[PDB]
Every structure is written in structure tokens, then in C-alpha cells.
Amino acid sequence: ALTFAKRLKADTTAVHDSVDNLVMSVQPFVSKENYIKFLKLQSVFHKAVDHIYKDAELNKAIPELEYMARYDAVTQDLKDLGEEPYKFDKELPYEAGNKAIGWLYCAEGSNLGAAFLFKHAQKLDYNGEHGARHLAPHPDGRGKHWRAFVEHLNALNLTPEAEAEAIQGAREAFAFYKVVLRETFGLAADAEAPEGMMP
Numbered sequence: 241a242l243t244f245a246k247r248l249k250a251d252t253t254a255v256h257d258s259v260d261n262l263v264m265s266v267q268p269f270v271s272k273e274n275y276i277k278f279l280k281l282q283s284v285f286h287k288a289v290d291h292i293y294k295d296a297e298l299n300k301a302i303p304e305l306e307y308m309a310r311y312d313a314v315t316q317d318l319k320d321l322g323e324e325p326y327k328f329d330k331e332l333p334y335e336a337g338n339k340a341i342g343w344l345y346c347a348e349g350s351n352l353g354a355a356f357l358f359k360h361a362q363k364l365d366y367n368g369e370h371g372a373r374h375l376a377p378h379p380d381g382r383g384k385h386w387r388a389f390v391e392h393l394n395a396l397n398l399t400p401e402a403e404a405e406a407i408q409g410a411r412e413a414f415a416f417y418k419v420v421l422r423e424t425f426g427l428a429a430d431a432e433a434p435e436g437m438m439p
């Protein structure tokens with residue numbers, strides 16, 4: 241990998257796939273009840289990167305970053321389902337520095353992949369205007385919007401030392417996501433999708 245954005249993906253594809261498999265494994269779209277659990281998980285994760293999107297310094301290296309946050313859309317999705325705002329039990333990670341960049345990558349990247357989730361959400365009468373607001377595509381199209389975001393990432397001009405932290409940060413973001421998922425769907429700690437399952 242000769243670029244920052246590509247190295248991130250490279251060092252996190254395995255953990256990313258474990259996330260994809262685990263989410264699918266818990267049947268988020270099998271019922272309104274389960275979907276609600278999926279929204280709560282999403283809520284927590286996006287609440288946890290809300291301070292990163294609105295990060296002064298980061299908004300200098302990346303334009304309109306703050307406006308890319310999906311936390312509100314998720315809370316509104318919860319509203320549409322008859323649920324009041326959800327709040328995590330434990331303490332929410334509040335990452336900063338280069339490791340927080342990894343978290344940003346994780347959250348922003350998840351948009352790129354919400355297409356699949358968006359499609360299955362729409363099978364439950366949940367679309368970008370109701371219930372699946374947080375999954376709808378960026379007005380400019382997931383592809384474009386993302387490739388652009390990528391330029392900004394590769395633009396930070398982080399040193400190998402910096403990337404190392406950001407990448408470790410991206411792994412930790414993916415790890416947290418699974419911790420919340422397990423708790424939200426009532427699984428044991430360290431629970432994973434059936435071994436051998438492919439995304």
C-alpha cells in the first residue's frame with residue numbers, strides 16, 4: 241500500500257470483515273425489535289465520534305467535516321421508531337489525536353458500506369426519509385463523497401509514526417463497535433460470527 245487511505249483499509253480489512261459478519265449474524269433486520277437494537281448500537285458508535293467530526297483542528301484540514309456527522313440522523317431514526325434518544329451504560333470513548341483520526345476513518349468509511357444495510361433497511365419500510373436516515377447515501381453519492389474524503393486523509397501528511405497511531409486507532413474503533421454490539425444484542429464478551437463465515 242503506497243497511500244495512507246489504502247494502508248488503513250489493508251490493516252483493518254480482517255477486523256472489518258469480522259464486524260460485517262457479526263452484525264449480519266445478529267439479524268438486525270429480522271424484526272422491528274432487533275432493528276431497534278441495531279439503531280441503539282449505531283447511536284452509541286456515532287455519539288462516540290461526534291466530538292471528532294466537530295474537532296476544530298480537524299475541520300481545518302478537512303472542510304465541512306463537522307457536517308458529516310450521522311449522530312442526529314440516528315437519533316431521528318430512533319424517534320421515527322417510537323424510541324427516545326439512547327444513551328450508553330458505560331463511559332463513552334472520547335478519543336483524540338492521531339488515534340482519533342483512525343476513528344474518523346472507521347465512521348466515515350462505514351457510510352461507504354451502508355449501502356447494503358440501506359437496501360435491507362428498505363425491506364422493512366425504512367428509507368432515508370424514515371427509520372434509515374443514517375444509512376441513506378450522501379447527496380453527492382457515496383462514491384464521490386468518499387474518494388474526496390480520502391484525498392483529505394492522505395492530505396493530513398501523517399508520518400509513519402502518526403499513521404501507526406491512526407491505524408491502531410481504527411482497529412480500536414472497530415473493536416469498540418463489537419463491544420457495544422455484543423452488549424446491545426445480549427452476547428457474551430468476545431462473541432463473534434460463526435467461524436468461517438464470509439462477508
Ligand code: HEM
Pocket residue numbers: 245248249256259260261263264285345346347348349350351352353354356357413414417
Ligand atoms: C454488515 C454491515 C456492513 C456491511 C455489509 C459492510 C460492507 C462494506 C462494503 C461492501 C464496503 C464497500 C465500500 C466500497 O468499496 O465502495 C464497506 C466499506 C467500509 N466499511 Fe463496512 N460494512 C458493514 C458495516 C460497517 C461498520 C459498522 C463499520 C464500522 C463501525 C464499517 C466500516 C467500513 C469502512 C471504514 C469502510 C471503508 C473501506 C475503505 O477504506 O474503502 N462497515 N463496508
